[PDB]
Symmetry: C6
Subunit: 214 residues, 6 copies
Amino acid sequence: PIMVHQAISPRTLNAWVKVVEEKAFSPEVIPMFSALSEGATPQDLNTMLNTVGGHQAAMQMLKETINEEAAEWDRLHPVHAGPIAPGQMREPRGSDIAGTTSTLQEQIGWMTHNPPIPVGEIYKRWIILGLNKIVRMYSPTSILDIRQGPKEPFRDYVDRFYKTLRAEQASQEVKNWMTETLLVQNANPDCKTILKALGSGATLEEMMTACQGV
Amino acid sequence: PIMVHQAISPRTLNAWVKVVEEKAFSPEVIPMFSALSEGATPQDLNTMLNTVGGHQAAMQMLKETINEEAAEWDRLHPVHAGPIAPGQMREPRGSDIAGTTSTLQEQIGWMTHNPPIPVGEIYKRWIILGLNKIVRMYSPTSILDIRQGPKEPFRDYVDRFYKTLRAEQASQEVKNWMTETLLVQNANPDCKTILKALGSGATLEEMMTACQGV
Amino acid sequence: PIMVHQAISPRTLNAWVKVVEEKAFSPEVIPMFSALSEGATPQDLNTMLNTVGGHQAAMQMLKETINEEAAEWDRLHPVHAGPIAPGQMREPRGSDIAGTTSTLQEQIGWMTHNPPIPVGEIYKRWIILGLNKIVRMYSPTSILDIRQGPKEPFRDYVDRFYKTLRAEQASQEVKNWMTETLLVQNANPDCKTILKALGSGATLEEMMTACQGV
Amino acid sequence: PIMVHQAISPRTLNAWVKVVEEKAFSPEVIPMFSALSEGATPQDLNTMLNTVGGHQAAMQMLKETINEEAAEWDRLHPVHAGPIAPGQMREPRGSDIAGTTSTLQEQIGWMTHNPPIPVGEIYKRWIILGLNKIVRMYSPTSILDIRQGPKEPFRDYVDRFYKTLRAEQASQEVKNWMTETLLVQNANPDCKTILKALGSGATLEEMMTACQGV
Amino acid sequence: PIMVHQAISPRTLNAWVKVVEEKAFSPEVIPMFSALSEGATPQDLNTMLNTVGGHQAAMQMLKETINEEAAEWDRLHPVHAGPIAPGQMREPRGSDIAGTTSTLQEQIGWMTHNPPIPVGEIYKRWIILGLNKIVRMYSPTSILDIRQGPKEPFRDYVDRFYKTLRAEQASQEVKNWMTETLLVQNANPDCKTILKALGSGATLEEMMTACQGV
Amino acid sequence: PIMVHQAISPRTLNAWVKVVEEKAFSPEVIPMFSALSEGATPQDLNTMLNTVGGHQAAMQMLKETINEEAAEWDRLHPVHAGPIAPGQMREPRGSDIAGTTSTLQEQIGWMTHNPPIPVGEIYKRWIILGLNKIVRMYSPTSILDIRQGPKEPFRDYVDRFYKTLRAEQASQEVKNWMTETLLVQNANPDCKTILKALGSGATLEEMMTACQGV
Ligand SMILES: [Cl-]
Ligand SMILES: [Cl-]
Ligand SMILES: [Cl-]
Ligand SMILES: [Cl-]
Ligand SMILES: [Cl-]
Ligand SMILES: [Cl-]
Ligand SMILES: [Cl-]
Ligand SMILES: [Cl-]
Ligand SMILES: [Cl-]
Ligand SMILES: [Cl-]
Ligand SMILES: [Cl-]
Ligand SMILES: [Cl-]
């Protein structure tokens, strides 16, 4: 990554490869990806994606999302005809942001220049957008089906609930509705009664400590 | 972390991930977290939290604590209306300290500027506050129940006592009362007699060496 | 690699060696190679190749490809007779780009000089060209033979399809034809009907989510 | 640690944690601790101690020793009343040296300032003092009980002798008396005769090579 | 290694040690050695050799080769009598290049001085010369004995051929003769016929793809 | 180690610890030690020795050798009475070189000052001197007892010979006599005849290749 240019480290690459083998597309893979690609050029971002073996339905799916975002960027940013003056550099296309039609030096130029054109962070947003689509498709369970089993420790039910909740790509408002509606509704009879008694404004801490004995 | 900005290292991230898998929320997890997040920006702190898979009841609980602290910061620090002058940067909100509504560059700006606004260390205190709440809730044993078993080496009883003591979030004054009261009271008959004979001002060293033979 | 010269790191070398032992010549080996050889001089590129034990039919094959590209470079770039002036350095031959007839200092000279002569990136392209030839020869399955089995989850069929597709060295236009023709054609009866109903312009996401239940 | 400030490295922390799990409080733990804490601030020293899980009787014992040394420092160094001038910084208390009542910046200030106030090395001496107390208490064998068994290779007896000797916290004069008295006295009959014949001034090398055959 | 002097890294040393234990004197050991000794002083080169345990017939053999090359250097470079002036440094002998009679500082002096006297790269060539002698002696199979077995995949026969070829220290002209003569001659009947039909100028790629079905 | 001071790295320390556990006092331990202690101050050298657990007969033996060398240094270098002037630093005693009576800063002073007083390299020579004494004492086999067994491959006999030779601390002249006398003398009948026929000036290479078939 990068403001002095640097190659992607052996142990960044290796760490990313192992993450995908072990955890596939579990929600936490996406923060790991972003963490390992901090300050990454499009070339470095493409490296991480291309070094993934297997999971090629998702990697192909990711390409289409990236292409869709590229087409959208080109629509909003039409390229103007003309010779690039000595002090300036050309406007990036969608394919330049995705790294397929731009050199490393062009990518370095845009990121470092005074008006920064952060193609690294733009392309990364496109990748993360497509990764979210994969997680949601690749999640086995639906949030609607998470119901506490009889004699299930609440703590284990809440772990399953917010884990499954974590893989829906839901906005904060949508995730807020699911919490106040499904969590208490789908608790088991013994603890559900207790939770109705806490009222309409109790924290998760209060709900978990309330059903700790039961 | 950071005064030159730096990305979170592959082996910092990986170390933190393994800590939580192996040790869950054992008291020592919190010092490990703080150690691995030294000089961290809110973006780096959020990275560590988001890269944790599982334990999503606690991670959700942690969000509420962070939001409570954010609401408290906003109450004490009301934002004033106006255009941010060239030489200055805006006042951070609670959400800016938690990183959700601020950019990396804004976080870098506050931490490096001459009046330092250490959003990293402020947000970290909020996270550590919530981590303490988790440890205490997630501790299986109570300090009141730690009693030395018949024929139990004192050393093993003291290990269990101060381990269980370690997970209560007790102030120094509260932890002091538990030591002078419960430790000797809940020792086994043979060693308890010996300890009453040491008097009301003996060190742990003297108590452990006194009951070494018995 | 390199603009200050640096030796190839112990853990770059070791990482590359393990990659080839574990994954042989699977498509992802090539992006891994390029990633680990970022900014590499021809000497560093030769190091990575020579440190590979076994697979000597491929490594020998790679030599011929490199020699073919060297012969082509010499044809296009004929060397002129004359003593190299103090301020300049000689024109590289194909063997100079491949590192066999040039010193490390000559390779450093070309890469750093004001008109950059990127022998590292030129030789790397020749190596990657030959690596593609190996992958295609060393691929066991043909893309034509990938047919979805009865009761096979589409997701698994698409994984096999784009994995096998990945090892053909096909241009984008050739890979595009295979997608729109073979993927739907070679699906199993139950899902194939569903896919004909999506129409002639649906994304992979829509095709995978359509055949998710079936 | 530090004269430019630096955070404690991931692999320093991890190394220290593993040392205590594997070797507990074996004499060599103390040199390992000092080695891993070279140039450490009190904050870094507290980190290493707090990240130790288990062994909480010793860690609590260590706190008391540190508090005793703190009380002693305060007695010898009484704090004077007054506002700290711009060019100077306040006098450290015992709690400031132990890091509990001082900030990282105050600790950095004292260590770097022209009259250096090495709170890191002072606090480290207090910690090492308490670690020695633990080793001696936690040693199972006494030096008095190490007697060479019949047919025991001297080399193995000398290994046991100086290992057990190593955990007594004995001054050089006390350890010198034990060598010249117990080592030869407690050897087995066959080798003991040989050693009396070497005389009152022979080296360990001469004693070991003398009893090599026997 | 080195133009600022540096000590050999822990992980360079360890990597080299493991290479020799696992792979002995397989052809690839020599490129690994050269890679790990890039920019090495004679002291660093001697370190790598001396840290090898076992294989002492080869390490002794290597000493003689180094001594032979040293004697040859002294013959070609006779030392002149005189006091070394302040601005200059003495001429290196063979033993100075091998590090046995020169200090680290003398080795640093020669490598860094304006007329560079690369004792590191000279001594390294002597070591690599002797390593080649070992590989050839320590190779179990002869290139003459590599014959394709009945029903042996050509690819496996070519792997064995160029592996065994790799350990002969043969010049390019000698290795060229073996390829065009033995490879086709010693193929099995079914594939041999096919290869005669390709003609006297076909690549390894064409030969391997020709005998792929057979 | 060091001309800017640096703390001993976590992975230097750990590497040294593992070396001694796995290989004890095999000849190669000594080059490993020297390699890992390149540029080490006496404090760093003492760290490596003190972090060794077990083997305390040898570590104690090493202390005596170091003390003997210290006494010898003091005899040759008598300390003169007087106050150390501002521009100068005091003369080191034997105990100052061994680090027991000197501070880290004094050790840094001597090593960096214009007339360098390399206490690191002096003390290291004393340690290496004592390590050689240990290896020789701790070697199980004598060079005199290495005789080639009937049907033993010469290569294996030469490995045993120069391995056992390696642990005698023999000068080059003493090791030279053992080679020309014992190696051929103690070979087995079949190969011994062959070696007498090579003559009185053949290399190890010629001797090993001569007895390769037999
Ligand atoms: Cl993310
Ligand atoms: Cl969520
Ligand atoms: Cl903490
Ligand atoms: Cl506590
Ligand atoms: Cl590639
Ligand atoms: Cl593809
Ligand atoms: Cl110590
Ligand atoms: Cl001792
Ligand atoms: Cl080589
Ligand atoms: Cl070859
Ligand atoms: Cl040595
Ligand atoms: Cl030897």
